[PDB]
Predict the 3D structure of the following.
Amino acid sequence: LNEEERLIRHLFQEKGYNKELRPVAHKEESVDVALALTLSNLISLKEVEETLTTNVWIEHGWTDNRLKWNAEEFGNISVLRLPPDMVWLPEIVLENNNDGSFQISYSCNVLVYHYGFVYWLPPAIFRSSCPISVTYFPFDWQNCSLKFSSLKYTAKEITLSLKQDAKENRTYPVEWIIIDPEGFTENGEWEIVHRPARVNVDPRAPLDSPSRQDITFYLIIRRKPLFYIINILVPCVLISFMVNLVFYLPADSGEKTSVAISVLLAQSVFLLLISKRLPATSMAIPLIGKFLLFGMVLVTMVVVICVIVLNIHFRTPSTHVLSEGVKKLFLETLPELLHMSRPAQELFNELKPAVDGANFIVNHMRDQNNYNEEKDSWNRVARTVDRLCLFVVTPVMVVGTAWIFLQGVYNQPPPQPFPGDPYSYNVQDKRFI
Amino acid sequence: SEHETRLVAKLFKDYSSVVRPVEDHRQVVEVTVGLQLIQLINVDEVNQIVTTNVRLKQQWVDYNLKWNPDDYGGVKKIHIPSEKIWRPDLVLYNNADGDFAIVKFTKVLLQYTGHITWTPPAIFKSYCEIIVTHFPFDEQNCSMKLGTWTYDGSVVAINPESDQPDLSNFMESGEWVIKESRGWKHSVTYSCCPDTPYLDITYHFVMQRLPLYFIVNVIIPCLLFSFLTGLVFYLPTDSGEKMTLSISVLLSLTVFLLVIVELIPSTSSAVPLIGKYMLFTMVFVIASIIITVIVINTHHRSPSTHVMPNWVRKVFIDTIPNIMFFSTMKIKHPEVKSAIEGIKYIAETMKSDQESNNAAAEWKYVAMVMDHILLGVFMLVCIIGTLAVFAGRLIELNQQ
Amino acid sequence: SEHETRLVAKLFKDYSSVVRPVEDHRQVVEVTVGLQLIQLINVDEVNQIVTTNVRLKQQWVDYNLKWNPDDYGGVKKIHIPSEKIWRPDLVLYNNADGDFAIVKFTKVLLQYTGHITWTPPAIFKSYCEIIVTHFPFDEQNCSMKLGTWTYDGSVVAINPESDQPDLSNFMESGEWVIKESRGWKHSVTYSCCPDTPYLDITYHFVMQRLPLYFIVNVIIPCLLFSFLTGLVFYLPTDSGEKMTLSISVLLSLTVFLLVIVELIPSTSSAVPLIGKYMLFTMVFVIASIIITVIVINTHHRSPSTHVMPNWVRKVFIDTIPNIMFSTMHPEVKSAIEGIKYIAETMKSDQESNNAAAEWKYVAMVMDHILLGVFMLVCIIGTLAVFAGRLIELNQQG
Amino acid sequence: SEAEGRLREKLFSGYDSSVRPAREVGDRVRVSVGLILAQLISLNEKDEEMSTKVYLDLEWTDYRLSWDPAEHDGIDSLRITAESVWLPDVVLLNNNDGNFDVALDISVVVSSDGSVRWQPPGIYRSSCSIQVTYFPFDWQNCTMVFSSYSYDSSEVSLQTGLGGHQEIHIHEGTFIENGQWEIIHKPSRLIQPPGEGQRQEVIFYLIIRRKPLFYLVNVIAPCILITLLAIFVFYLPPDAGEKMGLSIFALLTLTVFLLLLADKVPETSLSVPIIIKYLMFTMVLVTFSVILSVVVLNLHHRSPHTHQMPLWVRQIFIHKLPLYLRLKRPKLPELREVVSSISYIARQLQEQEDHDALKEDWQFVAMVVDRLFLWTFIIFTSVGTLVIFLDATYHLPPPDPFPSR
Amino acid sequence: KNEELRLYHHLFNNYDPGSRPVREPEDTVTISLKVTLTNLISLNEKEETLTTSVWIGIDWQDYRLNYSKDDFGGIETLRVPSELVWLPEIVLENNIDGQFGVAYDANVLVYEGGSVTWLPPAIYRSVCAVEVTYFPFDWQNCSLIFRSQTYNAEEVEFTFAVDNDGKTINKIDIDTEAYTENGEWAIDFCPGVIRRHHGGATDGPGETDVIYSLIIRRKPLFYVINIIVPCVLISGLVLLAYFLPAQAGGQKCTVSINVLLAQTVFLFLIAQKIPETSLSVPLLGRFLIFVMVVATLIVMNCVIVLNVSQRTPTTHAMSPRLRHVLLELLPRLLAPEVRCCVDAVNFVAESTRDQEATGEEVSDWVRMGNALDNICFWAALVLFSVGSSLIFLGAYFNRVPDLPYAPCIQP
């Protein structure tokens, strides 16, 4: 490499290149910096921390006329690799990081072409702030952004623009995140629906403010809910619906309240799990959380109903009076309305002690029969109440669960990345100048 | 060593570490790259990140770093800070939460011929897509794609030192066995740089999990509870403990399913067979609970509330017990007049109670027969379901 | 600034930070060391590490950094970077998982006389043997041994600035109260350097834990369950729920053993107070379960299959109840035989019921004595485990 | 620009960035300190630390960095790397992680009159003493104390950034609003030294109110539901044999929710959070429900012959109390051998009737005691829950950042 | 005036720290090594990481740094920053965290005669594979491997330091003034060995390193008090289900299944303390799985006994073989109105007799259940005791082998 040793010595020592001065003829001029983003891997979206971790390649392109040469003068060299600390740099950072890492991870070589174009494609692991919308979890879609700007320079000194490509000798801007098929790994949980890129200039900010300009790359990402469906929703929904079996359990089994409260405990453990997977924000209740709260309220109601049914079942003449109106309502009217199954002197004085005894025996058995019959009537009233409560509680739970989950099943990201803007920001639709 | 001091002063008098180290710029710098795996530190399934400790051996000739040993007192090799010389800028493409390039700048061994050997250490935290299908009997395939970042193949060429990674100094893992390992060179055209292919060397490791821990701590309790769910069908209804046993088993299996949920990544590329086992067995336990509630309801039926349907009698008392072991048994004083009438009343009351008890016994017999049929159904269903889920992968491993 | 620029240029023209800053090598550099504790960040009991935020004020004279203010516009004091000058190399001997030495190189204040005051900040992560014998009512005597690593006492001498650490800027802790704090200077001969004793200053902090959090979040639930333990003995056998109560209490105490064993280190120097209480109450619950099973078995004793021993009838029916409600034509002839048989069957049933009632009475007398004994044992065990330390803490003023 | 290069070369000839700018001995550098909050990242209760992303706004004058624009092609300002100029040693004194400095040094903007403006980004973890009493219905008072680490008040003077706004600046459009905290007040104050080495401070205060919806959804409502079931234990008949199971599983579920809270609450010991107080109140209520259910079961199952009901128990629990609770209680060898058998059977049934009457009397006492405990538990639960809820709800953030006390 | 400055300028004006202190390239630099352990900080079983605090003392000769006290005012020691002198670059090769070098770059001490001493402190996080078989009665073998990162054996070699009597200190040094004892881990042995290898002609230049082997014994009192004893007691509670009645309110199946649940909770308790490896099952894990299987079998036994005890004639017929086996063999091994009233009374008496016979068959079923319960209790107790005794006797015989090295800590 005699020739590019000569070229580097000519560019940097002979011409006295100063990397602290911008590449401009006059101080009033601005340096055009073209930016693009290539997503190699969406590493993660941590919902509790509300953080997006991405592996990206940040393409920077600008012109430095102090680094031009005639390739024929220097052995036909057309490109140079140089350390980035030898040349002026635009000093682009990720403004909306949430860990203090503003800069690219690895300061790779710049590529300097003989016509003065400086091309810099460093990689980076970026950790950015992504506020999470929890309303439709696990059927949710998210709207993350990666905002890039310069803190060392303002819109007066550099001018941010998007990378421009060419199709059939017609130039167009690259208004999207680039997905290189050779370098992209698909995320197993997150599908990229929209990936626009935008230059944002604040009209109200002064030109000498760093907040005047930025370039933002957005990721509209849809969660794949199959994992959460199979592993959480079907178990929780099945266990919750299992509580309705208590209305078909006989009161004499002695296990209705045990089943109902065990279902409540299972719902509480599910709530404990899902509360750890999402941030504790106050903007909305998660859909899974809404269903869990609905189910716990319904199960608490079912437990109270089981208590009432057990109370009615165990009533006896010695503590309660079975009114004829309650008898008619709960043993004739409701059972047919609900279509329940239905039933259907010396000898004299000598043996007088035995006759008096036998009459007392007869009265005892007759009274016991009447007592047992009233207890059976109370049991049947309890059965009727249980059947009515089944027919009332099961449809309510089914309808509420269907409503709650149909809110999330029909939740989709919008047809366009930006509401109110018809443009799609897709490579299929190039907006040629 | 004064000779080495003079040599080092001479070598770097007008040396450039920016410029590629061959005599003419049209030549390609040939780099031999080899990877030594010292330890597989960790495989984070949930975050899908593999932490390895590695040595990234890199060999190449620097044209401007040669000398005659006879001019320097026989000095034939020296040790130089790596920061002083040109180096290849190797980058791990699939870095997840580590460094892209080498950060530990250890010294290089430089021979008098100009040959350089640089063996920096690194801890690579690389991305590896986790295939959850066969967990905890799963086999992973975790790659390390290493390539010069800014130099294309026409200026710098990288070649594998060996076909395989160097595992001679590999520390034994308590969780993984490296079944296979192989290094492949690739030339790739990226959309950013058309007409200039960039080279990479990808080292892939096929590693089989050692499943003993998850067998002891997850699968065995799950099997014990999934065996206990079916003993509910041999429990008497009058024990008043069927719901207790079945609901306890369901709660235990649900807790274990959530432990497994915490153990795997939350991706939808595939469903684990362990998760399928858990969902199927929990659905089976819930079906068992539903049928148990039906059985208890049937057992408590009496003529005071229901009447035996003829179809139920035909099916469960005539046909099903035929395929059974047959272990079941399928004079004018008012007081005197009142006393005799009362004795007759007692006798008729006992007769009616006997008839009602017989009808209730028929209902209880039907419940018992359903309980026996369901016990046998549990035995075959649970056994063949556990086999259908696990024996496939077990036979697959045994065949290998 | 122009004057100070000229001064700074002059002071470091031929300065050396390698040599000790004395006119004569036979002299000792006299360093005054004062620790200021800003915050007690953490006391990790499991890992036995204390994290503190400190300022390590170090004062000493540099012979070659003097000037006459009259020659520099009256500038009498300046601030200079600490990395340019010789400094003492103070190291925390008992560093656990942090840095041994200062890493934040803040400016030094240099007077015209050559006096230097350097007050760097530090986050010290120091080892501390955590005595859990009285946890959560424990007192911890932690320390911070600081000394010049490479300079022995014959070339560099460190002296404490004050007898005590400076707590004037200390932030109050929500978990610990610093009862006492002292700073002692020591001279120690190490085997590595047989004839050159090295100096250190050890700052001791005695700290008492504030026990409200662990009382509310751990102890009170355990007391509630351990009180519920004794109530199985007032619960009737015929309820069919004795085992439910006792076993659920056992499971709750196991789940609390999880929390308690994660809260303490796994050392064997001593068993903690909370650990002793948890083992005592678990054994208490298990004895209650065993005795409850025995009581249930006694209550359901079939009079046909079992016969009351005479010793049982003497102990539980005669003696104990005093100590502790009440003690203890063919057809016509065939019909007559039937009535007689019914009467005999009722006689047999009544006798069997009386024997079963005797068994149930014995089981119930056992329940009464056990309720009394277990309430007394629970109360007295709780007091025997807690009052001994609580009285001492109340006495400590 | 070559003119910019010449101006930079002129400005930094003989310039020492380590020396504080002071044309005379005794001159003080006046530093204006302002703060822009880009994001309130978090407030960690366990570590008692506020994590923020901010931009400082530091303004001072360096007389050495002044020039005449007319002599330098009209250049009136310069952007210079912050390491090339003297900086005031402004640090966050009350940082909790040992990091005193800014995240990125970036560049200063120097005007021709020597005015230096520096706006570095900073990710800070500041110590905040968490007042736990009303958590999660609480408001916090988290300060960020900025000061010179080295220079005393006689060398570098501080003032609150204002041109006058004595507040943290928040841009409405671009502020990342926290989903758990609302900002109520955001003042800034200059603290004079206590009363040489003495120093001023500039403190930025963030009064922040928690948004408690999560805790209302995941903790409070389940606790209310479990409490409602603990009440309904007393309506469960003794003969069902399920009072112990219901009450004990209610207590266990409350323990599960205490485990839920254990990951969220602060760990200090200066006071007890109101939600923890409510949880302990609920746990004690369910424990007393267990105790009283045991008592009711003991009364209900009381054997009639082994126990004689005290007369005072009869008067209290059968005559007076049911009126108050609206409990109304409803309401010839062959012949001789036959006569003796019939008389014996009748005598045994009369004995059974007496035994059953005493059993029913004990069971009625159990029922009356159960109803009394049901009403007592309803009253105590409602009153205690109302008191705690009113204490929580009436805790409001301050109307003034600096109340007079 | 300071003689230190004159000596420093005399020694370091024309000194190269990049070159080894050898007069010929073929000569070797001998490094005398000592490692002083001040605190075995911890052994993280989950990470398989040993954290230690040490002083790494290295001594050698640098002929370029030779002086006499008589020429420099009697100076016998010069403290110099380590960056200004050549160092052999000793590193811990088997570190797990990527921290190869020492923690604090302390000054070197240059004595008269060319002797150079360096005693920096260090916190090292080293790899230690945990043998889980006998946990918590286990002992570990955690190695510390030191080597030069840069130089081969022919360039730099290692020797152990010697004590006052000239005896090689081929072990971890312990200074009583600067040693802290770990509360959970006693240090039984700490031999050091210098290994040389790769000396073959095809191999090329030889390599060398120094390996210390901390043989450490866990102090198991904590785990015995807080884990093993409660686990054993709640596991023994499973045998109580045999003495409960086989009635509706007996709660046999309640007690047994809940003991199984408690065992599962204890399995979770020991999961958070043991390594996550799969080369062996820990002894506590084996005991827990054994008692869990026993509790499952006892749950099945309770179900079978409940099935047998509650049989009644209306749905079952008396199996004579089972009755003989259980109740006999097992104990040995161990007017119109007048006529109508007479008919009525006869019906009452016959129904009473039928009730009596049905009740005599039910009592026989209950007695059979009781006999089965007793025999199964004795079998289960024998199985539980034998298995637990064998598993913990496995721990009883686990001890550090009788090695031929001196103890690490002098008593």
